[PDB]
Amino acid sequence: ARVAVLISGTGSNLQALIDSTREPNSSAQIDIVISNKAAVAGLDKAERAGIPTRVINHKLYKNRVEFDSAIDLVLEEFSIDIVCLAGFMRILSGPFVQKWNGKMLNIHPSLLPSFKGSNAHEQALETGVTVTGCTVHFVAEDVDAGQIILQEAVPVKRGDTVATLSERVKLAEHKIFPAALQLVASGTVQLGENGKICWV
Numbered sequence: 616a617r618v619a620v621l622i623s624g625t626g627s628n629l630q631a632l633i634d635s636t637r638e639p640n641s642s643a644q645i646d647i648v649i650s651n652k653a654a655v656a657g658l659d660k661a662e663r664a665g666i667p668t669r670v671i672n673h674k675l676y677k678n679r680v681e682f683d684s685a686i687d688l689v690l691e692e693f694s695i696d697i698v699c700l701a702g703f704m705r706i707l708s709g710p711f712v713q714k715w716n717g718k719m720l721n722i723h724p725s726l727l728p729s730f731k732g733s734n735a736h737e738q739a740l741e742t743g744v745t746v747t748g749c750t751v752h753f754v755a756e757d758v759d760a761g762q763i764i765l766q767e768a769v770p771v772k773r774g775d776t777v778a779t780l781s782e783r784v785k786l787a788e789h790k791i792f793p794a795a796l797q798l799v800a801s802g803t804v805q806l807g808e809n810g811k812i813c814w815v
């Protein structure tokens with residue numbers, strides 16, 4: 616399968632995906648990396664790996680549908696089968712999500728359905744959980760609410776900051792995201808017609 620990775624920052628998840636798709640017997644290859652923000656480290660990681668990049672600046676579009684179409688054009692240009700959202704920070708419009716239904720994955724740093732949203736760690740610390748984790752899910756219209764592919768629990772330590780908890784959880788993300796991509800790229804895991812996850 617030909618894979619696009621969308622990013623908005625550092626690209627540590629991207630990196631782990633790059634490394635795993637290049638292990639032998641991989642069912643996936645990353646063919647394009649797209650950022651909605653300029654000068655992010657994720658772009659350097661892509662180019663150092665010999666993978667083409669684009670910056671599609673979301674602030675230059677009148678609305679989300681048009682920004683999403685600019686992304687979609689690049690995905691067509693590159694004959695993309697599967698899209699990975701790896702620290703991508705833009706909510707995607709209805710028709711884009713529908714088009715990519717069953718073919719677009721996201722990494723989220725909590726055990727869904729707890730702590731939906733971009734500040735999951737801040738919420739986890741406020742709430743006082745001793746166990747959090749991360750989740751790979753198919754992307755649905757509803758934010759952080761698509762069908763769950765894989766999850767991994769991660770302990771919260773007494774005295775954790777957003778930074779320390781975030782680093783511990785990234786360690787788990789870098790395991791399950793590549794594993795989930797392989798599962799989908801190989802057709803082992805599919806979004807079924809009944810809207811539910813299917814393992815073959």
Ligand SMILES: NC1N[C@H](N)NC(=O)C1CCC[C@@H](c1ccc(C(=O)N[C@@H](CCC(=O)O)C(=O)O)cc1)C(O)(O)C(F)(F)F
Pocket residue numbers: 700702703704705706707708709712721722723724731732733734754755756757758759760761
């Ligand atoms: N891109 C998606 N589109 C749709 N329709 N459904 C999804 O499930 C997507 C996956 C969302 C992934 C995450 C997520 C949740 C909320 C936002 C959000 O509020 N974005 C704002 C911009 C916020 C900002 O600049 O800080 C904005 O206005 O776009 C950004 C990302 C995530 O919480 O899981 C995390 F961890 F990635 F942040």
